[PDB]
Structures are given as structure tokens and as C-alpha cells.
Amino acid sequence: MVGGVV
Ligand SMILES: O=C(O)C(F)(F)C(F)(F)F
């Protein structure tokens, strides 16, 4: 999985 970036 590629985590989101905020
Ligand atoms: O981590 C994932 O979901 C994946 F698709 F396997 C990646 F290719 F990005 F590594």
C-alpha cells in the first residue's frame, strides 16, 4: 500500500 500525503 502507498500511504497518502497531506
Ligand atoms: O504497495 C502497493 O500497493 C503496490 F501496488 F504493490 C506498489 F506497487 F505500489 F508497491
* Contacts (Cβ under 8 Å, ≥6 apart) of 1: none
CA distance 6 to 4: 7
DSSP-derived letter for residue 6 is -
d(CA 4, CA 1): 9
The Cα–Cα gap between 6 and 2 comes to: 13
Technique that determined the structure: X-ray
- Centre of ligand 1 to C-alpha 6, Å, is 19
* Residue 5 C-beta-side C-alpha neighbours within 13 Å: 1
Q: Give the total residue count for the chain.
A: 6
Which protein residue has the closest C-alpha to ligand 1 atom 3? 1
User: Closest ligand 1 atom, CA of 2?
Assistant: 1
- Tell me how far apart the alpha carbons of residues 1 and 5 are, in angstroms, rounded to a whole number: 13
DSSP 2: -
Distance, CA of 3 to CA of 1 (rounded, Å): 6
